[PDB]
Amino acid sequence: MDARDIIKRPVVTEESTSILDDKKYTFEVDTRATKTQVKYAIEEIFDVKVAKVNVMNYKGKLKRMGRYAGYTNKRRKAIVTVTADSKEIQFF
Amino acid sequence: MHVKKGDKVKVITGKDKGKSGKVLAAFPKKDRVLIEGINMVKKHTKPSNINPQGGILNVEAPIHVSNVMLIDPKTGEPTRVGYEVKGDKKVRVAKKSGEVID
Amino acid sequence: AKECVITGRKSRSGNKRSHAMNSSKRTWKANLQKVRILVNGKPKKVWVSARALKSGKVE
Amino acid sequence: ANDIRDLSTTEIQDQEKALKEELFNLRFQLATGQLENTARIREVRKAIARMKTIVREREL
RNA sequence: GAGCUGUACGUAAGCGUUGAUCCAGAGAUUUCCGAAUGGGGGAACCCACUAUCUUUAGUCGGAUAGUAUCCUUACGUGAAUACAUAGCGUGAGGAAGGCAGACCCAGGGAACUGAAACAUCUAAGUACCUGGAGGAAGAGAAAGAAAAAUCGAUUUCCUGAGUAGCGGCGAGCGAAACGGAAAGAGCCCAAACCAAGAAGCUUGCUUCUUGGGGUUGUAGGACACUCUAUACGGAGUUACAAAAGAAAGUUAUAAAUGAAGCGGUCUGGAAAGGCCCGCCAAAGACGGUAACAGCCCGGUAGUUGAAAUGGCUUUCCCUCCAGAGUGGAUCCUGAGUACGACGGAACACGUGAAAUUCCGUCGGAAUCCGGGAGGACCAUCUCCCAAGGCUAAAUACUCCCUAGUGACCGAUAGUGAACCAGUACCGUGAGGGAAAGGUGAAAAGCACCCCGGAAGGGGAGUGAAACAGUUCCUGAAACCGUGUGCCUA
RNA sequence: GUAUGAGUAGCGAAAGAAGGGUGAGAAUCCCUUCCACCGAAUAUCUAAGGUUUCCUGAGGAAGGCUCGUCCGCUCAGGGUUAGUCGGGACCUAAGCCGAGGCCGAUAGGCGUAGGCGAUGGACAACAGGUAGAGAUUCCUGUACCAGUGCUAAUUGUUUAAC
RNA sequence: UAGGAAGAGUAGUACUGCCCGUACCGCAAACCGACACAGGUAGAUGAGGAGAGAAUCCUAAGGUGAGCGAGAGAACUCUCGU
Ligand SMILES: [Mg+2]
Ligand SMILES: [Mg+2]
Ligand SMILES: [Mg+2]
Ligand SMILES: [Mg+2]
Ligand SMILES: [Mg+2]
Ligand SMILES: [Mg+2]
Ligand SMILES: [Mg+2]
Ligand SMILES: [Mg+2]
Ligand SMILES: [Mg+2]
Ligand SMILES: [Mg+2]
Ligand SMILES: [Mg+2]
Ligand SMILES: [Mg+2]
Ligand SMILES: [Mg+2]
Ligand SMILES: [Mg+2]
Ligand SMILES: [Mg+2]
Ligand SMILES: [Mg+2]
Ligand SMILES: [Mg+2]
Ligand SMILES: [Mg+2]
Ligand SMILES: [Mg+2]
Ligand SMILES: [Mg+2]
Ligand SMILES: [Mg+2]
Ligand SMILES: [Mg+2]
Ligand SMILES: [Mg+2]
Ligand SMILES: [Mg+2]
Ligand SMILES: [Mg+2]
Ligand SMILES: [Mg+2]
Ligand SMILES: [Mg+2]
Ligand SMILES: [Mg+2]
Ligand SMILES: [Mg+2]
Ligand SMILES: [Mg+2]
Ligand SMILES: [Mg+2]
Ligand SMILES: [Mg+2]
Ligand SMILES: [Mg+2]
Ligand SMILES: [Mg+2]
Ligand SMILES: [Mg+2]
Ligand SMILES: [Mg+2]
Ligand SMILES: [Mg+2]
Ligand SMILES: [Mg+2]
Ligand SMILES: [Mg+2]
Ligand SMILES: [Mg+2]
Ligand SMILES: [Mg+2]
Ligand SMILES: [Mg+2]
Ligand SMILES: [Mg+2]
Numbered sequence A: 001m002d003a004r005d006i007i008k009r010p011v012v013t014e015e016s017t018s019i020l021d022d023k024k025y026t027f028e029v030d031t032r033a034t035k036t037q038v039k040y041a042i043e044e045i046f047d048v049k050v051a052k053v054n055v056m057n058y059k060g061k062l063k064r065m066g067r068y069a070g071y072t073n074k075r076r077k078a079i080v081t082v083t084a085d086s087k088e089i090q091f092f
Numbered sequence B: 001m002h003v004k005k006g007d008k009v010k011v012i013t014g015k016d017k018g019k020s021g022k023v024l025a026a027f028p029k030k031d032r033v034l035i036e037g038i039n040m041v042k043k044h045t046k047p048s049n050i051n052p053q054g055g056i057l058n059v060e061a062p063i064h065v066s067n068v069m070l071i072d073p074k075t076g077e078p079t080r081v082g083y084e085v086k087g088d089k090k091v092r093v094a095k096k097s098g099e100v101i102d
Numbered sequence C: 001a002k003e004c005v006i007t008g009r010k011s012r013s014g015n016k017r018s019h020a021m022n023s024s025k026r027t028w029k030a031n032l033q034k035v036r037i038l039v040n041g042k043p044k045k046v047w048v049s050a051r052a053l054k055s056g057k058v059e
Numbered sequence D: 001a002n003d004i005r006d007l008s009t010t011e012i013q014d015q016e017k018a019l020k021e022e023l024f025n026l027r028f029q030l031a032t033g034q035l036e037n038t039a040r041i042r043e044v045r046k047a048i049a050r051m052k053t054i055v056r057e058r059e060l
Numbered sequence E: 001g002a003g004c005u006g007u008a009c010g011u012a013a014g015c016g017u018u019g020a021u022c023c024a025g026a027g028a029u030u031u032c033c034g035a036a037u038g039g040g041g042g043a044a045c046c047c048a049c050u051a052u053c054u055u056u057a058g059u060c061g062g063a064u065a066g067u068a069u070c071c072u073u074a075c076g077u078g079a080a081u082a083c084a085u086a087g088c089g090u091g092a093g094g095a096a097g098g099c100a101g102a103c104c105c106a107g108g109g110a111a112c113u114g115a116a117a118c119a120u121c122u123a124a125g126u127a128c129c130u131g132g133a134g135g136a137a138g139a140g141a142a143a144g145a146a147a148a149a150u151c152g153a154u155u156u157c158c159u160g161a162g163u164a165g166c167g168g169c170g171a172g173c174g175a176a177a178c179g180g181a182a183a184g185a186g187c188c189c190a191a192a193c194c195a196a197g198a199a200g201c202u203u204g205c206u207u208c209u210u211g212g213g214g215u216u217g218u219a220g221g222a223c224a225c226u227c228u229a230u231a232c233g234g235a236g237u238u239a240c241a242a243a244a245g246a247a248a249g250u251u252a253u254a255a256a257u258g259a260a261g262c263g264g265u266c267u268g269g270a271a272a273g274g275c276c277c278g279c280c281a282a283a284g285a286c287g288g289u290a291a292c293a294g295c296c297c298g299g300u301a302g303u304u305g306a307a308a309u310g311g312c313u314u315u316c317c318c319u320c321c322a323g324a325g326u327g328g329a330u331c332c333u334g335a336g337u338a339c340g341a342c343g344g345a346a347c348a349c350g351u352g353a354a355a356u357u358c359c360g361u362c363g364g365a366a367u368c369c370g371g372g373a374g375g376a377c378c379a380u381c382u383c384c385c386a387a388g389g390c391u392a393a394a395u396a397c398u399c400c401c402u403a404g405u406g407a408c409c410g411a412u413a414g415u416g417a418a419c420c421a422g423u424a425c426c427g428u429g430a431g432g433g434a435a436a437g438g439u440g441a442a443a444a445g446c447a448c449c450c451c452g453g454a455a456g457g458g459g460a461g462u463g464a465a466a467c468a469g470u471u472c473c474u475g476a477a478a479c480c481g482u483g484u485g486c487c488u489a
Numbered sequence F: 001g002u003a004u005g006a007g008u009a010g011c012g013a014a015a016g017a018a019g020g021g022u023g024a025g026a027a028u029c030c031c032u033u034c035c036a037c038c039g040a041a042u043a044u045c046u047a048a049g050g051u052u053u054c055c056u057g058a059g060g061a062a063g064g065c066u067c068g069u070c071c072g073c074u075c076a077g078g079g080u081u082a083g084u085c086g087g088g089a090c091c092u093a094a095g096c097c098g099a100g101g102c103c104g105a106u107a108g109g110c111g112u113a114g115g116c117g118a119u120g121g122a123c124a125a126c127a128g129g130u131a132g133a134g135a136u137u138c139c140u141g142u143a144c145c146a147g148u149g150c151u152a153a154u155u156g157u158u159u160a161a162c
Numbered sequence G: 001u002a003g004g005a006a007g008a009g010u011a012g013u014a015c016u017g018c019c020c021g022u023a024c025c026g027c028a029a030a031c032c033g034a035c036a037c038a039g040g041u042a043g044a045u046g047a048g049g050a051g052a053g054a055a056u057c058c059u060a061a062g063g064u065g066a067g068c069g070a071g072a073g074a075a076c077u078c079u080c081g082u
Helices: A035-045 D011-032 D040-058
Strands: A007-010 A024-029 A050-058 A062-065 A068-071 A075-082 B008-011 B020-027 B032-035 B040-045 B055-060 B068-070 B081-085 B090-094 C012-016 C024-028 C032-038 C043-049
Touching: A007 A035, A007 D011, A024 A035, A035 A050, A035 A075, B008 B032, D011 D040
Parallel strands: none
Antiparallel strands: A007 A024, A024 A075, A050 A075, A062 A068, B008 B020, B008 B068, B020 B032, B040 B055, B081 B090, C012 C024, C032 C043
16 A cells, blocks of 8 residues: 555644654555554655654544444554654645 | 526515526425425524624525426516427427527 | 165165054164275276175175 | 547556546645635546446447 | 435535536445455454565565465375385366245254153154255155056145044054146166277286167067168257357336416415315325315326346247167176164054065075056956156245235334334343333424523513423322311310 | 312431521532541442443533532533553364265254364563543653564575574 | 474574454442442552551541531530540
């Protein structure tokens, strides 16, 4: 699968935007994506030099609208830090 | 449906019988037609983003298509409608006026 | 398995009556013997009934 | 559909990649909160599907 | 042919007479688990190998294909052991699993109950488990039925008939043929015999392959001769051998056209209703529309319509084909089977005088002057040739699709389920399993003022109705309250 | 569906008191002081189990055996970072599956090679920081284990270093 | 050792290292008991005075005041003291 199907969308929250000046970017990746495929996906798209990647898996919450209950989409989140001598992603 | 957007209409039945108007919208999913000046209502709308002041509004309400029959644009009376293929196209022909409505 | 290779002989069921005809249940087997015969030109040890073997088969 | 059947099967790949990139930016822009034309995503995504169908049937 | 982005209100952003949304036919894509089949596994997860390509300075990473087991068949390699087999590998074909809780064929096979107890018997070859299919299955072309004469493959229906029979002769079980109908269709091998080939050496012989012949009963065939036909004619993929193709018509899957009252008037919130006048009808079926409509709308009778796919019929094409007679030297006509003893089973028939068919074990024929049956058996007579195979229709059922019907139900009824139902809930698990329909014609779903934090109210307004205000048509009884006429320490 | 028993039994071991604050509303919510309780536990970690109950901002209909401005309750947003920790890509016990195979009316049973299976064996990381929620995981400092490329010189060649 | 072999080590630099779990409760109001239930739930650490001791009484670090109250001080019932 291509580099733009490994990565889906950015994550903009209070915690995610807190580490922008620390050169740590948070992304939504595919569930089957590994820690290595993400490293090469970013290098191809944004043309930077990835130094370290961390990932974690989130279970689906149990929402309830009316009398119908279901599970929110299961997610996989990755945090990618770029080396010092690499250009910064806009992400704004 | 025998009536589309833009036709001129003479109503048949209802509390508002005998008046004429022009159609403003059509709802084939429920067989109802909106005609200006016909079947007005009063909406008690709370002040909101749209029309900030709010109040009593005088807008129209849809009516069933069955209570509507098309009038001949030229001669000017209501009449039933018929379809006659001509010029590689289908047009509406009045059963009374004997002319193409469109 | 437990069936004559040549014929179709194998186990079959039935009743075991007695005096006063108290019907029980039982079974009938066949004289299946383990012998070596020729099936495709290759000797093999298979079941052959004694009635079938009594004429026309070479061991 | 037929507007692109005249292409030479090699610039279609350039159209596959160009439209795939534009789709990514739209998802990136929507997530941040900068996209005001949210309808564009669908036409871009259909056009990606349209081009792949023609290539598939060209080689049967 | 003018609106559309589902249920689903609504916001944002858009698309459509360059013809969108929509309907029907044909294609394309089709993650993971699941017979799951590269290995593993606690369902949707983990871990690989062999090739080709791709990326990096290289490790790392990515893309495509193949890699399960068994059966059949060819090739190659190859042990004790010399040849060879067993084994090993490759190549090509087939299978696995599911269900429609229905129908039917086979293997295995109860008990409760009845007999007013109970064991023979009945319940019953029923319930259930297992295997095999098919749109149907099974049966099927007489070793038949029957008797003063004959019929002529099988299956199903009416009668025969609760008859003849079986039965601790108890409870009970219970036929068949003739007769009347639906449908009707007949064929292919084995064996002698001829020809070719091969192996053994059965040593010029017999035992195997193929082709040609040939299949029946007052016997037929091989064998001898006469006659004719080598496509003149005949048949066909539903048996009789099998594989395809073209054209025409017809049907199913979208659709089109389609007559006649805006008639006057009364009540009403609204006319389809009452009164008085007209029209169409191959159309007075059904539904909707502010109340009961043939003439307001979708339609109905009638008449048209198909680019594409599938079915059905016909024709063409294609393919394949020897059948009549007279002599009867000799030869052939399904062997460990037909029957018999022993022990069981099915036949309406429970060992009984027990004919008929089948199973397990022993014994064990004749073969055309021959053999079987006609309810033990012998003789005469009559009918028929078993121990190989195939075969459409009349018959049984409905998970489904289309068009309809009911002196069937109408929310405690009808499916468990008219409603996000095998759901919520219960149980470790198999499993058990609910309750819950209605505002109004149209949201016109109460702007605004007052009390209150809010809920909730009193006015105002919409509405025919608000005493229809989001469990909202109608609103009984139990039960809970307020006021009063008569009585009561 | 609704009564009688009836405003009755009960309100599930335990020491609270006062002063400020918020609020429409305070014995029950926040803060302060005094007092009392456990202290081989009523303390600190960590398996099984549960699966969002964890944090922040709003709410008081229902749940809380009273009250509520509060909550493990309602609504909306967030939160789990590993070469070194535990388990896989390592190993096997009990046990389970099982190509061929043996047995058996059908279904299937037993079992070899082989493979799964921790409660056991082997295996490289420590100290500090972090006022909303993660820490041997993120950050600072200092290491270790396996592997690769690039330089540096050294060394060896088919009685064949390694 | 059988075998495989033209490449090998050492030093110095830079670079690479996958999947699953990680919140929270965890002698409890979040697990098993229909309950915010006087019951049950493996393992590690588990201080001081007196003491042989993880007994016993009072305390340290740490955690709590128990999800109905106030006011009278009758019979009777229960748990205690003479
Ligand atoms: Mg992780
Ligand atoms: Mg099958
Ligand atoms: Mg079956
Ligand atoms: Mg048949
Ligand atoms: Mg009409
Ligand atoms: Mg009228
Ligand atoms: Mg009415
Ligand atoms: Mg007998
Ligand atoms: Mg007879
Ligand atoms: Mg048959
Ligand atoms: Mg009712
Ligand atoms: Mg019901
Ligand atoms: Mg459960
Ligand atoms: Mg109010
Ligand atoms: Mg009323
Ligand atoms: Mg009504
Ligand atoms: Mg009392
Ligand atoms: Mg009390
Ligand atoms: Mg308490
Ligand atoms: Mg206080
Ligand atoms: Mg309290
Ligand atoms: Mg104490
Ligand atoms: Mg856990
Ligand atoms: Mg919380
Ligand atoms: Mg409350
Ligand atoms: Mg309360
Ligand atoms: Mg909460
Ligand atoms: Mg480990
Ligand atoms: Mg096997
Ligand atoms: Mg086993
Ligand atoms: Mg293992
Ligand atoms: Mg372990
Ligand atoms: Mg370690
Ligand atoms: Mg914490
Ligand atoms: Mg730390
Ligand atoms: Mg804890
Ligand atoms: Mg509990
Ligand atoms: Mg409590
Ligand atoms: Mg407890
Ligand atoms: Mg001491
Ligand atoms: Mg102590
Ligand atoms: Mg103690
Ligand atoms: Mg303390």
